[PDB]
Design an enzyme around this catalytic site. Structure first.
Site, PDB file in Angstrom:
ATOM      1  N   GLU A 162       0.819  -1.223   0.000  1.00  0.00           N
ATOM      2  CA  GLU A 162       0.000   0.000   0.000  1.00  0.00           C
ATOM      3  C   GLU A 162       0.853   1.273   0.000  1.00  0.00           C
ATOM      4  OE1 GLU A 162      -2.924  -0.190   3.139  1.00  0.00           O
ATOM      5  OE2 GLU A 162      -4.266  -1.380   1.863  1.00  0.00           O
ATOM      6  N   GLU A 231      -6.737  -8.213  -0.617  1.00  0.00           N
ATOM      7  CA  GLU A 231      -7.306  -8.244   0.731  1.00  0.00           C
ATOM      8  C   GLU A 231      -8.801  -7.990   0.709  1.00  0.00           C
ATOM      9  OE1 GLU A 231      -5.279  -5.467   3.251  1.00  0.00           O
ATOM     10  OE2 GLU A 231      -3.279  -6.115   2.555  1.00  0.00           O
TER      11      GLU A 231
END
Ligand SMILES: *[C@@H]1O[C@H](CO)[C@@H](O[C@@H]2O[C@H](CO)[C@@H](O)[C@H](O)[C@H]2NC(C)=O)[C@H](O)[C@H]1NC(C)=O
Ligand SMILES: *[C@@H]1O[C@H](CO)[C@@H](O)[C@H](O)[C@H]1NC(C)=O
Ligand SMILES: NC(=[NH2+])NCCC[C@H](N)C(=O)O
Ligand SMILES: [Cl-]
Ligand SMILES: [Cl-]
Ligand SMILES: [Cl-]
Ligand SMILES: [Cl-]
Length: 701
Positions: A162, A231
């Site tokens: 991220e 995710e």
């Protein structure tokens, strides 16, 4: 020609020449034990998973520079080989920034103090260390042919985690670091694809991926890359002082079907098994020892029904549909105002269809290929042959289960050992806590002298001066002349603290001793590694003749950790080396107290927990092994109200346990016990009654 390979196209990851719709789940190896791994992996296989995803945890593997740990539950190679034995693939998320609600985001704390270091940017010391660790892991995997290109299970790996949002804030050096990280990783020559999550600018040949509760609208940054969801959040983390978050099975199933019906070819449950933050170098900032995540496999490895079975059935429906899914692309037909058919019809005639109702409030009956299908609100029906619906995401055919924690064995015989409060390694002013302790202990004593003139106004008028202590966090105990004056503690969102109170002081030298406590280190946020812990002030004493005295502008002394830590009271050898208090003199509801007892392992195969409701805050060990932090004294704060599966989920939507201890039960792995003579040591920071501690057996029914 290579016998084994992994490539990709616009449709899917391609394993040994075949496109696959890959169903994946996260299991973090050091969040369970090697004895648990085969069982967890089998449950995942039986639950319909094709892949196990895990981060690599740098701080666990490299506790000091060039000194490595791959033992026990940090035996990464062993874990990967167990996944392979179950016939599952691996997505290895190397990072080595991993976030993961994990201490310091995975970075070893020593890394912060390397000369010239700056984390997660185009910084030379950072890049050298990062490249060295990623290269080490990749070479360890290659040495035993663990990438799929060599016949092993690893089909892809992730570099960074991220980073996109970090670049957004720090600008060009972030852009440069991204490009460097991608090319460095690709240059390690794994033979399989690399991925980056939340990285719109990921350079070829890296595939950028999506994280979140929903990812149906996501597309990767090139048309020739597959659409992947790294995710699928299955719930949320538990924080100390927070409630227990749930995410409804029906909403998870809807989100997955919504992604798969829109060309999605890889999705991974985060978490599939969440497990436990053992010891004191696992939890991130204010993250509870329980990492349950409302995962399909609960903290203890038990099936979380009905979620486990509902997703198992979704996976069966996807498998029935797969030959159509991999030989066509999703074609949309409108069915109604908020209803669609996504159809995968191959040149050969294979056909799978998804019928959707996005209305969060109302059911709609649609007609598809001359047949009626009722679609509950916020649901999708899957027709693996375009003819008969075998599954709908809102129709749960698995029975639910509840938790039972049943006491086993009764109460234990306790002995105690007191910590001492030290008194005025020195400095003129206040030092940041991580700097001083290097995270070797949660505990740092800040100590100083306060001299009081005989002519102070408060002495002649029978009043007390007023002390204010400000700290960056995370817990603060203020001792004045050896007596505890107050305890303040923060929250995940706001770890900073202010103690303020009247304190009794006498003419001459007075002692102020502050016990400053960290509760895991920050693991996310731009520049999170620069955030302070500990007492940096202001520290002021008012009500004096002079007005207010600045206590930061004088000599301070420091003491890292606890005496019990120096003595290794957590271990059999250390605890046996000193004499403990026994009998009626047992410390009760007293801060900074060690407790010990011996117990026999309960019979049978049920998972085990310690009921810590009678305690406050501290740390637990069994046979010298750290069970984790306890903090039942931190009551769950938040909003807990009835939730419906329907409509856009957020992490606070389905919270439970408000107004109760944030975590009461603490997981004890079966494999940490011997039949007899198990040593249980508890450090109690706040105060408790150890007699109330018991073992429980966990079951689902
Ligand atoms: C699944 O992917 C297909 C193929 O990329 C998408 O259909 C194409 O959509 C693009 C616009 O993004 C058009 O330029 C092409 O003409 C379309 N091709 C075909 C064969 O229709 C489709 O939109 C995707 N499905 C969904 C619902 O996301
Ligand atoms: C860190 O500790 C060192 C001593 O090793 C000291 O020189 C320095 O000022 C400290 N800095 C902070 C921010 O605490
Ligand atoms: N309900 C939604 N589809 N919201 C958008 C989800 C955004 C997605 N998680 C991403 O990061 O790109
Ligand atoms: Cl993961
Ligand atoms: Cl272990
Ligand atoms: Cl390669
Ligand atoms: Cl175990």
């Amino acid at each position: 020609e290579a016998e084994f390979s992994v490539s990709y196209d616009d449709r899917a990851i391609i394993i040994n020449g075949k496109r696959k719709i890959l169903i994946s789940g996260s299991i973090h190896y050091p969040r369970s034990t090697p004895q648990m791994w085969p069982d967890l992996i089998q449950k995942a296989k039986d639950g319909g998973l094709d892949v196990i995803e895990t981060y690599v945890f740098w701080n666990g593997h490299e506790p000091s520079p060039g000194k490595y740990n791959f033992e026990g539950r940090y035996d990464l190679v062993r874990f990967i080989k167990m996944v392979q034995r179950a016939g599952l693939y691996v997505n290895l998320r190397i990072g080595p920034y991993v976030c993961a609600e994990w201490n310091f985001g995975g970075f070893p704390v020593w890394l912060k103090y390397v000369p010239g270091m700056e984390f997660r940017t185009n910084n030379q010391p950072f890049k050298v260390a990062m490249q060295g660790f990623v290269q080490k892991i990749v070479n360890m995997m290659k040495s035993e042919n663990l990438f799929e290109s060599q016949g092993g299970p690893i089909i892809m790996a992730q570099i960074e985690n991220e980073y996109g949002p970090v670049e957004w804030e720090i600008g060009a050096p972030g852009k440069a670091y991204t490009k460097w990280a991608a090319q460095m990783a690709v240059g390690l020559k794994t033979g399989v694809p690399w991925i980056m999550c939340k990285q719109e600018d990921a350079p070829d040949p890296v595939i950028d991926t999506c994280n979140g509760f929903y990812c149906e609208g996501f597309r990767p940054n090139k048309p020739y890359k597959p659409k992947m969801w790294t995710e699928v959040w299955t719930g949320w983390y538990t924080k100390f002082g927070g409630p227990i978050p749930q995410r409804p099975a029906e909403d998870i199933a809807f989100s997955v079907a919504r992604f798969v019906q829109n060309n999605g070819s890889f999705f991974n449950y985060y978490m599939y098994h969440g497990g436990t933050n053992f010891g004191r170098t696992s939890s991130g900032l204010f993250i509870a020892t329980s990492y349950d995540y409302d995962a399909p496999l609960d903290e203890y490895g038990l099936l979380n029904e009905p979620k486990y079975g509902h997703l198992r059935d979704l996976h069966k429906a996807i498998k029935l549909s797969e030959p159509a899914l991999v030989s066509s692309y999703a074609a949309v037909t409108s069915l109604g105002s908020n209803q669609e058919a996504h159809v995968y019809r191959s040149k050969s005639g294979a056909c799978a269809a998804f019928l959707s109702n996005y209305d969060s409030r109302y059911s709609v009956k649609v007609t598809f290929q001359n047949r009626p299908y009722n679609l509950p609100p916020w649901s999708i029906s899957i027709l693996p042959d375009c003819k008969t619906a075998v599954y709908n995401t809102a129709q749960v055919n698995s029975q639910s289960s509840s938790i039972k924690m049943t006491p086993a064995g009764g109460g234990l015989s306790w002995q105690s050992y007191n910590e001492e409060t030290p008194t005025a390694l020195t400095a003129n002013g206040l030092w940041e806590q991580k700097n001083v302790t290097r995270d070797s202990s949660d505990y740092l004593w800040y100590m100083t002298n306060v001299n009081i003139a005989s002519n102070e106004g408060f002495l002649k008028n029978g009043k007390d001066p007023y002390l204010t202590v400000m700290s960056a966090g995370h817990v603060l105990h203020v001792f004045v002349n050896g007596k505890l004056s107050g305890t303040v503690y923060g929250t995940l969102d706001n770890p900073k603290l202010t103690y303020s109170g009247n304190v009794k002081l006498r003419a001459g030298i007075n002692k102020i001793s502050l016990l400053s406590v960290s509760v895991g280190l920050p693991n996310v946020g731009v520049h999170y590694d620069t955030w302070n812990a500990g007492v940096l002030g202001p520290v002021t004493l008012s009500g004096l003749n002079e007005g207010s005295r600045n206590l930061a502008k004088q000599k301070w002394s420091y003491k890292v950790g606890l005496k019990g830590e120096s003595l290794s009271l957590h271990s059999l050898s250390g605890s046996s080396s000193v004499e403990w208090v026994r009998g009626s003199l047992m410390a009760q509801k007293q801060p900074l107290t060690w407790y010990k007892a011996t117990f026999n392992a309960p019979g049978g195969n049920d998972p085990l927990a310690l009921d810590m409701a009678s305690m406050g805050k501290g740390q637990i060990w069994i046979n010298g092994e750290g069970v984790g932090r306890h903090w039942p004294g931190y009551i769950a704060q938040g909003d807990c109200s009835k939730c419906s599966y329907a409509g856009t989920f957020n992490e606070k939507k389905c919270q439970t346990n408000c107004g109760q201890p944030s975590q009461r039960w603490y997981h004890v792995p079966r494999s940490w016990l011997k039949p007899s003579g198990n040593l249980l040591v508890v450090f109690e920071e706040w105060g408790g009654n150890p007699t109330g501690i018991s073992l429980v057996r966990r079951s689902r029914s």
